[PDB]
Amino acid sequence: RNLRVLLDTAIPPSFCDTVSSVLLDDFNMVSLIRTSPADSLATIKQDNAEIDIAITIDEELKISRFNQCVLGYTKAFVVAHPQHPLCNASLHSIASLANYRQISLGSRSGQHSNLLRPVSDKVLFVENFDDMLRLVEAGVGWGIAPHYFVEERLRNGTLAVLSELYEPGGIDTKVYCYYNTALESERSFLRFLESARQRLRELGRQ
Ligand SMILES: FC(F)(F)c1cc(NCc2cnc(-c3ccc(Oc4ccccc4)cc3)s2)ccn1
């Protein structure tokens, strides 16, 4: 009937709004929460919070009271400041990157998903992407960010990309939809999945 829905901050706005309208058509009351992917799963697991659907890039199989399925995809970029050493290098390996400071989401204390697990031994953590980019643009290091976030800075030369040999066009990242088990049998939920997936496909095409 009613729904509390979490969407992590790597899910682009177009994607969010898509999920929003589908859920508002197929459900009654809809509430949204936004969190960094580092805190996405960590949030829903709290028995205290009552989140019924959670849409995030963070991977985790067997979570209590929740299912998993794939809703769509999003693309992320390895970015650094344009005069950063790694940009004047052209060549790319994960070791070349590991010898420099990563600016990464998450808190050092705690189980870091293999997704947000820093690659460098020299890391500097942040709470959100705004802060991450503050440091990157100040040449303090390099980071991983959503496309929608850094599109602007890349258009404007503010910011470079280090991932264009690894995966041209950025790094495809699954978007998982962890759904409370009680919804498995709700035809409203199944309709939502169907419609949101179709729309997101038509959108990814564009
Ligand atoms: F949310 C968000 F921001 F999109 C986001 C998505 C994520 N997805 C999974 C990945 C985690 N590490 C990825 C990665 C890192 C460094 C790479 O370096 C290079 C460079 C050039 C040649 C070879 C290797 C390549 C791939 S991909 C992770 C974190 N954050």
Q: DSSP secondary structure string, 109-142?
A: SS---TTT--SSSSEEEESSHHHHHHHHHTTS-E
Closest CA to 88 of 162, 27, 37, 143: 162
The three-class DSSP label of residue 177 is: strand
Angle at 41 between CA 45 and CA 193, to 5 degrees: 100
Say if residues 143 and 102 touch (Cβ distance below 8 Å): yes
Instruction: Compute the distance from residue 181 Cα to the ligand 1 centre, in Å.
Output: 31
Strand 70-80 and strand 171-179: the pairing is: antiparallel
Owner of token pair 């808190």: 107
Strand 102-105 and strand 142-146: the pairing is: parallel
Angle at 141 between CA 140 and CA 144, to 5 degrees: 135
| Closest ligand 1 atom to Cα of 97 | 18
Structural domain spans, the chain = 1-206
Q: Ligand 1: residues whose CB is within 6 Å?
A: 10, 37, 57, 76, 78, 92-94, 97, 115-116, 119, 144-146, 162-163, 165-166, 171, 173
Q: How far is CA 190 from CA 90, 171, 186, in A?
A: 46, 29, 7
Torsion angle of C-alpha atoms 194, 197, 201, 206, degrees rounded to 10: 120
User: What CA–CA distance (Å, rounded) separates 7 from 57?
Assistant: 9
